[PDB]
Ligand binder design. Structure first.
Ligand code: ZN
Ligand code: ZN
Lengths: 221, 305, 314, 37, 83, 40, 36, 129, 13, 209, 174, 25, 48, 209
């Protein structure tokens, strides 16, 4: 119902001069649209490009279900036992939320706590999930402990069984009634606070904050 | 047939809108929890109303305050704070673009001093009514009035020469009627299970002492004057002496008064921002009830049609 | 202008602005040095029984004026700004006049004023054989960003030149060299400029009163001569303009207050700006619309009144 | 502030020798790609 | 005043009219201004497009010494002579 | 009835009448007029 | 289009669109009266 | 300490260059808030005089970021570490009333009052995994 | 649950 | 007095200093300004309203015997401003608005009276409109029984001139002009400073306990 | 005059406070030649701009307008009804158009009615550019064809600087 | 808990009823 | 103490040193300038 | 014009109000307004717009829908809707100077008409940002929005109903007779009441002088 927001961002007025360009916002337009892509192939995850694990595909999975390999192993990273209904063959369960300790466990203790021996670091590991996000996070975990061959199946259980289930949807969009830090706290100068809070437009256009602008005297002439 | 179809369509739309309203605050199965008030404050909200009242009580004068309490690394009179926060927030920058204030939220605060002296209910029941405004998350005082039973009796007797306020008196003659609304309780978790009727106990103690004291027959005028939810209350407090323009007051006096309001008395900028957040959250909550009500009326019309 | 961070590099609006502002070339041409083929000579603007004034009008491509006071009794000269692209002309001028250059009074530390300070000091000291710098300490912010403006405007030669005001003056702890550099003559002015005590004795009973007038620069200082009715404002009050506010640490409200700080001086006070033509305080009071707004808003009751220019400073 | 590392006409009395060789084509072997078929 | 006259019609609200440039150059005084010298008249009811008034002073400037210093000359210019 | 030319505002360049200079150091000086009897 | 990725008219329209919020020059509620 | 670290993180988000819309820009990860409050709780176990600045930090965090079950759980853990069992139990009962399940990571860290969350998160002390 | 509560408050007669 | 039991000593001392300054101030005048002839000025201490009353007897042509005396009353309420939006919004202009009741002869104010609402701006007073109360003949009758609302009349600035001239004469003969408005303003100033002193004293008493 | 007094008159219009970067009068660039003659190409520019401004963000906080009114611009243009003809339409024709033709949802008619009830001038104005995205918002006057009788905005004037209408030719529309 | 009533008798009987609650409480 | 927006009160100047003597400040004047009248309940006074 | 189907109008001179009512066997609808004293916006478009309230009581549902709506060009826009527990009562109706129920409002801002009017540079209700400045004429929603029921007491609801829901609500409410015909008649009657009442006031003023 388009709830009014409680942020104190405000466009500049039409009476006073523009001043204090120590901080100055502007609109920020990137090159391409990115929302259509995989979550971890977007701009804010660009730094982990070499870290994103290799992608396995539907034909490889359908081959491997029938003709399994002694060393490879599929791992289901699904968490909601209620959400997970059916079983991908030759797969071991290891939910994403506890990989941090699962991969720290010892060889004996891992078998003790999970019932299947901890794979060797030189072995091929495949990770699948609902949409691939839990599999990606689990693969990052696996890579941290120096596991050489880690893969994820991006189109996972949903593609296998035709399911339309979804993985975690925990986005940290601040609730409208919460007022962010800059408008509340007293930590910088008055004019700096005003210029930080100012935005040139509808406050959903992904503006950019730049510091220390200088006048283009040659253009002005 | 057209009436039945229209009513059923409206009912379906209301059901869908409430479904979406609840879905917005999912947070993976846990519905949004209300903002948590500061230490010791307890907030109560009449259901279906556009205001909430939050109470606090300091058994000691000010030494019970958090600022005087920290000090880490005579039995003066006890204090009672009651903050009335309605659902009125607007942007003054929209009506005239010459004002650089985005939000402006008004809320009233009454402080009453009680025996553990003209502040006691027996001696005039002098209390202070201070209006507060949140402007871009900043609490400033709009006005401070010192209201008393003497003022209440004067307003009913001698605001004018001999028969005060033909207008205030007529407002008293009408005075409407009270309609008890079921009271929802959002109180500081620490105090959420100790006492649930403390605000009623203190309100009753004050009301009975004031009524049984002098100015007894004028107590109803005092109650209407102190009414923080009615238009007659605001007009009566306007007939009273509005405090001096604080910007016209002294710089050091304003500084000391802000110190007293914030640190000593305990109502701080954290409390102000919480008041704004709760104004938002409870309006959100009441919108759900409004959707339920529209669904109810539409379904009843469809059933009777 | 500013450092090219990842956002500045991945923003398309930055490239759009670069193409539009400066055409097919994405860089600004900056302000170059005026060629010697088109440089004027120093003119004598005032002759008085006590002091005289000599200056050049368009010293930089920034159109900054250069001024020098000569005491006429102690044979002491004093440059106002180190803005002249050709300081050796002034050096020869003072050598021919047999004068002694004692101080350089930086009204404020913008590039148009400080661009040639090192060249002025080197040439003048070489001819002398120290020369002090009088500046407000509030502008260490501009002094430490002197390099950034030079890089932006293409004055690369002066880029790698430590400013003389940064060289461990008497207000700063001195070096402890091994048993196997200090500037004693420079002075730092205080923002609490009083009409009674804050001044410098130019000699022969002439007292130069400096006035703290921020808003265009955080540490802006005007100079006043309440004996020949002369006011070196500088980037504050021009013929038909006022100082800019589109700059870092530039505030319209404090600029307006600085403007109001001139409400008592006599009307026949001639103001020589840091740029442009000389005007008079009466004409500025009567025909300057920036000042007219500064006062009309105050009349109608603006509590926080801000004025300032946003297109070009002379 | 935090200092920045300093990065780097030609007179006729100078040697007029080429400053540095450039190998762009050998570094990037661009396959032939033409709009026309 | 100091003013400008253009050859072609522009009107006050729109430049559409029934007379061509060859007629308007005479109607609006462009040719008259080209022709006439310094001491002649100029019609008042034809438009002017850059009229700027020259600043005035009280004391007459005629027979005023040019050897004054530049600063006091500016002071006299702007109607506030020193002393 | 102190004349303006002989007042504190004249020495401090403060205008005779009008809005106060909110950013002038005289107004920015913290004031405690009720403690001099305890401090001096 | 190669180095900057935009055309001149495209850049002008983009400038006008990004500066739309402050380009708006409405009419103010007239008749402000002198107080001081 | 964590209370200063929180303000530093908020300043970084305020002066960042990309400046997404504020609801996306100023909301730190809930896991990050949990880790920071768990560091605060570990520090509280040592002196418990830290609890007043913990109160102030949590009072600011509540209204600056989203009040999630795991941040509430970290607050309860630091309350217990400070020694205010009554208040910790009251906050847990409020969790139960609002139907907020307790955080299992905070539960595990509760029973390990010698393992601060940053070392636990690192690949150190694996034997206690 | 919310509708049942509102029924309890009597906002939905 | 001691900080241990009175941690608000800073505020109490500041209030005492303010009271002492407000008292020792040589500008203050003990005597309220003298009202114009025939007026008795009432004011309840602690209220933001003061009243003035006088009796008057109109002239008459055609010698209609026993020109019925009238009672003139003035109600003046102290102007209020809110400083929460002070630094941003421009100053609120000073002005003294009052109401002028006239009723022909114990009956109250809003029952059988003609009220004129006027505002004394810094320079001169200006009448906004004329409100009625009671039954009136119209020269048929009209009833104004609403005390809060009613029909306060078209704003006189855009009201018809035939009525404006009659209203202006009907005021100038009653002697309601700028000289009365300036007195209203200065009496409001005095009343408001008295209320300020009372407010300081009561605040001092309340804060201490 | 030791200290000349600045000129500050006692009454000032609020519009006189509008900011200009160099505190001078902004230039007035004349509009494009396509506005020389009011044809079917340009006769709907005011409608375009008014609908765009009513559909976009509003206020200094950029409050989003939830209803998009541009989707009816194509239908109005196909009807041949420009902003001036909308102003001429009476209440009955407005009901007929909103129900039969445009199919305006009541929440959209409610947002569009403030622009018809005010009879806004709806004429392009010169503003320092060839594009001129400024349309006069003064209340209309029936004597001037529902155009404010102020500068240039008189009967049949469509664009500020170019010319009056040619209703004789406009009869060629259909 | 403000409740209006039409009979003095019906009011006093319920007042006596209320006294029992206020006493046994 | 009850200040108006436009009206100002003019006060005498103590000496020729102005509000801040640029020439210098003596030991007792500096002692007073250091021990300024702050509300003691919120001030830490410390020596070394 | 003519009255809508099945409606009876009530108006008395000097009240500056009129209320028109219609009871259907089940439902009862009563719509009330008080024409402003200030100049009214002309019906032709080229000043306070006429805004009224409509109480729709459905005994079957056990609630009453109070709809704040204003008529423009003879049409209507329903800016607010709220619900009340009881059936229609005279205390609920703001017919006299007393308001209806207080401390209840929850209307979700069905319409962005206030936002739409501010792009066409229409001044609107709030002329001064300072509330106390406008509070001089208390108990008058026309000239004191901060206590005006029809103006929401100056509050902007946090929500704005989704257009597909708002149009459905408007259509549902139009079935009970709150249609554009009702709004057209209400606006016509508002102009007639304004004119005739102003004429009576002028006659009284002329008669006294
Ligand atoms: Zn400069
Ligand atoms: Zn127009």
């Amino acid at each position: 119902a388009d709830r009014r927001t409680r942020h104190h961002m405000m466009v500049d007025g039409q009476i006073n001069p523009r001043e204090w360009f120590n901080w100055h916002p502007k609109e920020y337009q990137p090159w391409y649209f990115d929302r259509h892509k995989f979550l971890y192939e977007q701009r804010q995850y660009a730094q982990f490009h070499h870290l994103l694990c290799h992608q396995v595909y539907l034909k490889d999975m359908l081959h491997l279900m029938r003709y399994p390999e002694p060393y490879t192993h599929i791992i289901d990273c699904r968490t909601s036992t209620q959400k997970m209904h059916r079983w991908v063959p030759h797969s071991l369960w290891l939910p994403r939320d506890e990989v941090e300790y699962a991969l720290q466990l010892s060889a004996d203790e891992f078998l003790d706590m999970y019932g299947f021996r901890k794979p060797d670091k030189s072995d091929d590991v495949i990770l699948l999930s609902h949409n691939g996000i839990y599999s990606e996070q689990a693969g990052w975990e696996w890579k941290k402990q120096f596991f050489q061959h880690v893969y994820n199946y991006r189109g996972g259980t949903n593609e296998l069984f035709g399911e339309s289930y979804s993985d975690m949807n925990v986005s940290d969009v601040l609730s409208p009634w919460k007022g962010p830090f800059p408008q509340s706290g007293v930590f910088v100068d008055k004019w700096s606070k005003r210029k930080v809070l100012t935005r040139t437009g509808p406050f959903d256009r992904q503006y950019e904050m730049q510091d220390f602008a200088l006048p283009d005297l040659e253009l002005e002439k | 047939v057209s009436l039945r179809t229209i009513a059923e369509s409206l009912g379906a739309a209301a059901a869908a809108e409430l479904r979406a309203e609840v879905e917005r605050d999912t947070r993976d199965g846990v519905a949004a929890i209300p903002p948590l008030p500061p230490l010791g404050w307890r907030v109560r909200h009449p259901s279906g109303s556009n205001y909430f009242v939050m109470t606090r009580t300091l058994k000691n004068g000010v030494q019970s305050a958090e600022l005087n309490n920290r000090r880490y690394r005579l039995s003066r009179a006890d204090v009672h704070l009651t903050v009335f926060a309605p659902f009125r927030v607007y942007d003054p920058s929209l009506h005239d673009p010459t004002v650089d204030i985005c939000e402006w939220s008004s809320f009233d605060l009454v402080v009453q001093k009680t025996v553990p002296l003209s502040c006691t209910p027996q001696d005039g029941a002098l209390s202070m009514y201070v209006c507060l405004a949140s402007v871009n998350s900043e609490m400033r005082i709009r006005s401070i009035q010192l209201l008393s039973m003497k003022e209440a009796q004067a307003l009913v007797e001698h605001a004018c020469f001999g028969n005060g306020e033909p207008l205030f008196l007529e407002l008293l003659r009408r005075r409407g009627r009270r309609r008890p609304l079921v009271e929802r309780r959002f109180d500081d978790p620490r105090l959420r299970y100790e006492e649930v009727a403390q605000p009623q106990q203190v309100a009753d103690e004050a009301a009975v002492a004031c009524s049984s004291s002098c100015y007894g027959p004028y107590y109803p005028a005092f109650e209407m004057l102190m009414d923080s939810c009615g238009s007659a209350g605001e007009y009566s407090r306007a007939l009273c002496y509005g405090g001096p323009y604080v910007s016209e007051l002294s710089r050091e006096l304003c500084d000391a008064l802000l110190d007293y309001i914030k640190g000593d008395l305990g109502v701080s900028d954290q409390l102000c921002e919480y008041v704004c957040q709760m104004q938002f959250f409870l309006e959100q909550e009441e919108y759900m009830t409004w959707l339920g009500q529209v669904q109810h009326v539409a379904n009843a019309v469809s059933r009777t049609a | 202008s500013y450092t090219p961070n990842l956002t500045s590099l991945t923003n398309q609006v930055n490239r759009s602005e670069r193409l539009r502002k400066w055409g097919s070339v994405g860089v600004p041409p900056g302000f170059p040095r005026i060629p010697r083929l088109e440089a004027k000579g120093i003119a004598i603007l005032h002759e008085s029984p006590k002091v005289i004034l000599a200056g050049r009008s368009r010293c930089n491509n920034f159109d900054s004026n250069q001024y020098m006071l000569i005491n006429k009794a102690t044979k002491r000269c004093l440059l106002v700004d180190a803005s002249d692209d050709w300081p050796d002309d002034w050096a020869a001028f003072i050598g021919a006049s047999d004068l002694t250059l004692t101080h350089v009074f930086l009204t404020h530390c913008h590039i148009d004023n400080i661009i040639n300070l090192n060249a002025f000091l080197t040439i003048c000291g070489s001819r002398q054989k120290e020369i002090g710098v009088m500046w407000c300490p509030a502008e260490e912010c501009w002094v430490q960003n002197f390099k950034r403006s030079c890089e932006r405007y293409g004055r690369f030669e002066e880029m790698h030149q430590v400013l003389p005001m940064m060289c461990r003056s008497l207000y700063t702890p001195q070096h402890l060299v091994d048993p196997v550099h200090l500037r004693r003559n420079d002075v730092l002015l205080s923002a609490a400029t009083n009409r009674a005590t804050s001044f410098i004795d130019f000699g022969n009973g002439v007292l130069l009163y400096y006035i703290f007038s921020p808003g265009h620069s955080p540490g802006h200082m005007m100079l006043h001569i309440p004996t020949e009715r002369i006011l070196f404002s500088g980037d504050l009050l021009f013929f038909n303009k006022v100082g800019r506010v589109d700059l870092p640490w530039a505030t319209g409200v404090r600029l307006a207050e600085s403007l109001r700080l001139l409400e008592a001086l006599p009307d026949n006070t001639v103001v020589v700006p840091g740029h442009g033509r000389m005007t008079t305080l009466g004409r500025e009071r009567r025909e300057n619309e920036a000042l007219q707004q500064c006062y009309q808003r105050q009349e109608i009751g603006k509590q926080e009144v801000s004025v300032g220019f946003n297109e070009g400073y002379l | 502030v935090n200092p920045d590392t300093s990065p780097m006409h030609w007179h006729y009395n100078l040697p007029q020798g080429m400053e540095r060789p450039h190998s762009v084509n050998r570094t990037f072997a661009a396959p032939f790609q033409s709009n026309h078929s | 005043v100091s003013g400008r006259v253009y050859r072609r019609f522009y009107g006050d609200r729109n430049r559409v009219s029934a007379h061509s440039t060859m007629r308007w150059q005479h109607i609006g005084g462009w040719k008259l201004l080209k022709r006439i010298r310094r001491g002649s008249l100029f019609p008042h009811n034809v438009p002017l497009y850059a009229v700027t008034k020259h600043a005035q002073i009280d004391f007459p400037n005629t027979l005023l010494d040019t050897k004054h210093s530049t600063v006091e000359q500016t002071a006299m210019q702007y109607n506030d002579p020193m002393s | 009835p102190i004349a303006y030319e002989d007042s504190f505002e004249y020495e401090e360049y403060i205008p005779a009448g009008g809005s106060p200079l909110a950013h002038h150091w005289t107004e920015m000086t913290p004031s405690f007029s009720y403690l001099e009897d305890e401090f001096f | 289009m190669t180095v900057h990725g935009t055309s001149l008219p495209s850049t002008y329209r983009m400038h006008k669109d990004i500066n739309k919020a402050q380009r708006n020059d409405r009419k103010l509620s007239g008749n402000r009266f002198k107080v001081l | 300490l964590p209370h200063v670290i929180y303000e530093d993180f908020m300043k970084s988000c305020t002066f960042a260059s990309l400046q997404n819309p504020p609801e996306e820009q100023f909301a730190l990860p809930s896991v990050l808030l949990r880790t920071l409050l768990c560091m605060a709780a570990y520090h509280c176990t040592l002196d418990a005089d830290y609890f007043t600045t913990c109160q102030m930090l949590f009072g600011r965090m509540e209204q600056q970021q989203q009040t999630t079950p795991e941040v509430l759980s970290a607050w309860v853990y630091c309350c217990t570490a400070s020694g205010r069992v009554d208040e910790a139990l009251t906050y847990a009962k409020y969790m139960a009333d609002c139907s907020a399940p307790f955080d299992v990571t905070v539960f595990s860290l509760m029973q390990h009052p010698s393992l601060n969350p940053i070392e636990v998160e690192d690949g150190s002390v694996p034997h206690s995994a | 649950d919310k509708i049942e509560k509102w029924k309890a408050e009597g906002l939905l007669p | 007095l001691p900080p241990s039991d009175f941690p608000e000593n800073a505020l109490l001392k500041c209030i005492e200093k303010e009271i002492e300054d407000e008292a020792l101030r040589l500008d203050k005048e003990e005597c309220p300004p003298p009202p114009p002839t025939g007026w008795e000025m009432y004011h309840a201490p602690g209220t933001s309203v003061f009243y003035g009353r006088r009796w008057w007897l109109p002239a008459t042509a055609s010698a209609e015997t026993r020109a019925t005396p009238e009672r003139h009353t003035i109600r003046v309420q102290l102007t209020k401003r809110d400083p929460s939006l002070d630094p941003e919004c421009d100053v609120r202009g000073e002005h003294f608005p009052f109401s002028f009741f006239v009723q022909r002869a114990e009956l109250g104010l809003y029952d059988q009276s003609i009220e004129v609402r006027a505002d004394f701006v810094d320079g001169e007073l200006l009448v906004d409109n004329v409100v009625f109360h009671g039954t009136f003949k119209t020269g048929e009758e009209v009833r104004y029984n609403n005390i809060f609302n009613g029909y306060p009349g078209p704003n006189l600035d855009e009201a018809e001139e035939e009525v404006l001239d009659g209203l202006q004469a009907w005021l100038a003969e009653r002697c309601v002009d700028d000289q009365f408005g300036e007195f209203v303003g200065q009496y409001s100033v005095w009343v408001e400073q008295q209320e300020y002193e009372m407010w300081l004293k009561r605040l001092r008493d309340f804060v201490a306990a | 005059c030791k200290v000349s007094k600045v000129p500050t008159r006692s009454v000032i219009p609020a519009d006189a406070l509008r900011y200009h970067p160099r505190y001078s009068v902004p230039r007035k660039m004349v509009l494009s030649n396509t506005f020389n003659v009011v044809g079917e190409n340009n006769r709907y520019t005011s409608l375009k701009l008014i609908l765009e401004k009513l559909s976009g963000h509003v206020g200094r906080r950029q409050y989003k307008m939830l209803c998009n009114l541009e989707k009816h611009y194509d239908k109005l243009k196909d009807e041949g009804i420009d902003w001036h003809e909308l102003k001429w339409l009476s209440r009955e024709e407005l009901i007929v158009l909103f129900d039969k033709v445009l199919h305006l949802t009541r929440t959209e008619r409610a947002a569009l009615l403030p622009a018809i009830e005010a009879k806004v001038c709806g004429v392009l104005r010169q503003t320092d550019s060839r594009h001129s995205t400024v349309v006069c918002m003064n209340r209309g006057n029936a004597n001037h064809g529902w155009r404010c009788g102020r500068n240039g905005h008189t009967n049949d004037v469509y664009f500020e600087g170019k010319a009056k209408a040619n209703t004789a030719a406009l009869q060629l529309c259909r | 808990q403000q409740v209006v009533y039409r009979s003095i008798r019906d009011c006093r009987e319920r007042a006596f009823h209320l006294i029992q609650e206020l006493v046994s409480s | 103490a009850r200040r108006k927006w436009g009206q100002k009160t003019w006060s005498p100047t103590a000496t020729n040193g102005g509000a801040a003597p640029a020439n210098g400040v003596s030991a007792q004047e500096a002692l007073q300038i250091a021990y300024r009248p702050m509300p003691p309940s919120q001030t830490v006074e410390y020596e070394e | 014009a003519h009255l809508p189907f099945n409606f009876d109008v009530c108006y008395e001179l000097g009240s500056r109000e009129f209320t028109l009512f219609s009871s259907v066997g089940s439902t009862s609808v009563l719509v009330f307004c008080n024409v402003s004293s200030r100049r009214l916006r002309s019906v032709k478009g080229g000043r306070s717009p006429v805004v009224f309230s409509a109480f729709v009581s459905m005994p079957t549902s056990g609630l009453t829908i109070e709809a704040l709506c204003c008529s423009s060009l003879g049409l209507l826009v329903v800016d607010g809707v709220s619900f009340h527990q009881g059936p229609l009562t005279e205390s609920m109706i703001p017919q006299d100077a007393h308001p209806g129920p207080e401390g209840h409002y929850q209307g979700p801002l069905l319409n962005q008409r206030s936002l739409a009017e501010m792009v066409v540079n229409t001044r609107g209700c709030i002329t001064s940002v300072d509330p106390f400045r406008q509070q001089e004429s208390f108990f008058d929603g026309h000239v004191n929005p901060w206590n005006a029921r029809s103006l929401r007491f100056g509050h902007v609801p946090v929500h704005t109903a989704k257009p597909g829901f708002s149009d459905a609500l408007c259509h549902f409410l139009e079935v009970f007779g709150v249609n554009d015909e009702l709004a057209f008649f209400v606006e016509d009657f508002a102009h007639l009441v304004h004119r005739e009442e102003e004429t009576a006031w002028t006659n009284v003023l002329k008669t006294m002088m």
